[model samples]
Target chain A: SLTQEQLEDARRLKAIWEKKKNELGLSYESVADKMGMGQSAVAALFNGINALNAYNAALLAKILKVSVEEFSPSIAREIR
Target chain B: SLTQEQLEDARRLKAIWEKKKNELGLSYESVADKMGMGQSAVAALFNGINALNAYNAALLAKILKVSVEEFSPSIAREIR
Candidate 1:
């Protein structure tokens, strides 16, 4: 479950979420409720205060309101 | 089709719906009615929205009780 590292990887993820929130004008509170997490949890995730758990990371793409394809790019390997 | 996102927007969306079966509860009946779609279509989506087209995913995700990111990370990448 633990393998690689990329210093700004967390930021990339945070960017995706933030992009969605800003572009879509979505509220973190509503997204947290949908994610089955707390508002603080969603806030932390957006700012990279929390490292993404694989499960929850997957959940992020959904709450951010992006397409599965659009959000599927995990990084360089997956991004292409 | 577009790209990959590493998440389980589909399952968790269902999980979230199932989690709050009462709190944020929605039924195929009510959800379908709200989406202006029929009940059977909603059932089809719950069964396998993972493979749905973008348009369908948008509508289905809404009915399945999820944000857009929850619908992200399509599984279509894994099999091929």
Candidate 2:
């Protein structure tokens, strides 16, 4: 089962991604393109249907211009 | 960098696994076989090159007839 913390992390990450989306003027398609993941995969993360792995946490952290700690400190610790 | 404390948990977990290996009459290959991971993957956990994720932790707990708390209490909370 999914945890509240998943959505807790997801909502904020989505919000950050949204801000980046507007500033960069990128569509969802290209957004997924740039992230090198399918929309479904990224959507699963944003929807809290799944969590990131592999310092894929770091991947988003870098691309989002946010620290993993800001959105997912637990993941930050795990990767370390 | 890995923290001193994760290092703490990893060694503690490994120690418990060592104890279990003897009483359970299990070897690394069987541990890998039962865990459904490659031998190398299981070796990493035993060697402390990596730690157990929830799946292997739960499976290890199950196979050992012990709770994750009994072996790796840190992972017990992690399982939740």
Which has the greatest TM-score?
Answer: 2
Model 1, which residues run further than 4 Å from truth? A1-80, B1-10, B60-65, B75-80
- Model 2, B1-80: lDDT tens digits are 34565566567667876765533434565566667778788777766677667788788776555777765667789888
TM-score of 1: 0.38
Q: What is the TM-score of each candidate against the true structure?
A: 0.38, 0.46
Off by over 4 Å in 2: B1-80
Alpha carbon deviation, residue A64, candidate 1 (Å): 8.3
Q: Tell me, by lDDT, which candidate is best.
A: 2
